Amino acid sequence: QTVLPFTGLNTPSGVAVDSAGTVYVTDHGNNRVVKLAAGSTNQVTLPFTGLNTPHGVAVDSAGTVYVTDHGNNRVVKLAAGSNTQTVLPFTGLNTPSGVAVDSAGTVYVTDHGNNRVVKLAAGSTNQVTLPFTGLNTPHGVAVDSAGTVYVTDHGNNRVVKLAAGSNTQTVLPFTGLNTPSGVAVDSAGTVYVTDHGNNRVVKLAAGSTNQVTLPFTGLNTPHGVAVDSAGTVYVTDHGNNRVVKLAA
């Protein structure tokens, strides 16, 4: 386990990693989003403005960065190479937490306060509610290359998934979870979950029934998880104000 050379993090929450290995962190307690290029020792503050207790972070294939501005019940994005953020036209959000973006630019948000997950096609002004059932304070969301949507049903200690267009969810065969937070999915379909209440990260290969505990050490109320193209796993060790990683 390697501690990434971020500085000054305060209760960090969301984490994402893009195709170049740049790691994006929502520095929730400082109302900012920072990033660290692969192999770099100096973080960069992204020119977001007006954030308030931000939570989730995502990056799409064009390098646009999306942040759940939780305290303001909104989702904001910033194109790579741009100074001017834009606000996504979501409506009626309440303490939203996670955000994910698929290969078509569709944006998915866990509307945590309303026990629902909503999505917005790129350029649309009309969100739709995904047909999840029985969610209870959902936290994390991820979407894979097939458009399958994965959600940590935090209040119910389970992880559920919805195939693209599918009408009822599948409960993933995790076991023993406790207030799970972040979720990530790698290129092989392996699902990674921050088992926040148990201070651990677990993973489940696609179609497998037996989860595996990753060898992180000393985690304290961890929040987000991300996995890059090399299979390296990144975790926001929220209670310790750090981001740690495990190479495969």
How far is Cα 209 from Cα 187, in angstroms, rounded to an integer? 19
Q: DSSP assignment, residue 68?
A: E
| CA separation for the pair 128, 148 (Å, rounded) | 16
**Rounded to the nearest 5°, which phi and psi values hold at 168?**
-140, 150
Own/partner contacts of 47-50, CB < 8 Å, gap of 24 or more, are 47/78, 47/83, 47/85, 48/76, 48/78, 48/85, 49/85
CA–CA separation, 88 and 247 (whole Å): 34
Write the residues followed by a gap in the chain (C–N more than 2.5 A): none
Continuous segment of H or E residues that includes residue 44: strand 44-45
124-145: string of b/e by CB count within 10 Å (b at 16+)?
A: eeebeebebeebebbbbbbbbe
User: Do residues 74 and 54 touch, judged by C-beta distance below 8 A?
Assistant: no
What lies within 8 Å, CB to CB, of 9 at 6+ separation is 25, 27, 29, 30, 34, 241, 242, 243
The amino acid sitting at 37 is A
Please count the other Cβ atoms lying within 10 Å of the Cβ belonging to residue 245: 19
Distance CA(41)–CA(70), nearest Å, equals 29
How was this structure determined? It was done by X-ray
* Structural contact between residues 99 and 108, judged by C-beta atoms closer than 8 angstroms: yes
Tokens at 112, concatenated: 């945590």
- Resolution (angstroms) equals 1.5
Residue 77 has φ and ψ, to the nearest 5°, of: -135, 160
- The domain tally of the chain equals 1
**217 within 8 A of 202, measured Cβ to Cβ:** no
∠ CA 126-69-166 to the nearest 5 degrees? 45
Domain of 34?
Answer: 1-248
Question: What is the side-by-side order of every strand in the sheet holding 200-204?
Answer: 183-185, 191-195, 200-204, 212-213
The alpha carbon dihedral of 45, 51, 55, 61 has a sign of negative
Residue 167 host element (H or E): none
The b/e string for 45-58 (b: 16+ C-beta within 10 A; e otherwise) is ebebeebebbbbbb
3-state secondary structure of 133: coil
Token pair, residue 30, equals 């400082």
| Rg from Cα positions in the chain | 16
State the residue for tokens 């209760």: 11
- Whichever domain contains 244, its CATH number is 2.120.10.30
- d(C-alpha 80, C-alpha 164), whole Å: 27
In Å, what is the CA distance from 77 to each residue of 107, 146, 239? 10, 23, 26
* 3-class state of residue 100 by DSSP: strand
- The residues near 41 (Cβ < 8 Å, ≥ 6 apart) are 5
